[PDB]
Design an enzyme around this catalytic site. Structure first.
Site, PDB file in Angstrom:
ATOM      1  N   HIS A  15     -35.268  40.067 132.989  1.00 47.92           N
ATOM      2  CA  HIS A  15     -34.407  39.795 131.841  1.00 47.92           C
ATOM      3  C   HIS A  15     -33.125  40.580 131.993  1.00 47.92           C
ATOM      4  O   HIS A  15     -33.038  41.520 132.802  1.00 47.92           O
ATOM      5  CB  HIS A  15     -35.086  40.193 130.518  1.00 47.92           C
ATOM      6  CG  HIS A  15     -36.306  39.391 130.214  1.00 47.92           C
ATOM      7  ND1 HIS A  15     -37.569  39.782 130.609  1.00 47.92           N
ATOM      8  CD2 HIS A  15     -36.454  38.195 129.594  1.00 47.92           C
ATOM      9  CE1 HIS A  15     -38.443  38.862 130.239  1.00 47.92           C
ATOM     10  NE2 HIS A  15     -37.792  37.889 129.624  1.00 47.92           N
ATOM     11  N   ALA A  16     -32.133  40.197 131.201  1.00 46.91           N
ATOM     12  CA  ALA A  16     -30.847  40.879 131.169  1.00 46.91           C
ATOM     13  C   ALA A  16     -30.213  40.887 132.552  1.00 46.91           C
ATOM     14  O   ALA A  16     -30.328  39.906 133.281  1.00 46.91           O
ATOM     15  CB  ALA A  16     -30.995  42.286 130.595  1.00 46.91           C
TER      16      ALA A  16
END
Length: 88
Positions: A15-16
């Site tokens: 994620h991110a």
């Protein structure tokens, strides 16, 4: 075909920024590349695919690559993951 199983150990999992670094790194290769978790297989070059897998810190995934640069592709993704995407 080259395959490896590996724990994602960085805080955000896939994620991110790590998710972006993952897809960008996979995209450098001509091989088809997949990530699998819990009987679900997605295109490693697809941000939607990676998100749909919901890979958090500590999760183990199976990476696989098929093509002319499959060894190089897997090594690149392994190296990126083992550096925790540059994070301490």
């Amino acid at each position: 075909m080259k395959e490896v199983t590996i724990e994602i150990k960085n805080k955000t999992g896939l994620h991110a920024r790590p998710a972006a670094l993952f897809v960008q790194t996979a995209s450098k290769f001509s091989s088809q590349i997949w990530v699998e978790k819990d009987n679900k297989k997605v295109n490693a070059k697809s941000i939607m695919g990676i998100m749909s897998l919901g890979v958090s810190q500590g999760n183990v995934v199976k990476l696989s690559a098929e093509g002319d640069d499959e060894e190089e592709a897997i090594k690149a993704l392994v190296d990126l993951i083992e550096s925790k995407f540059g994070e301490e």
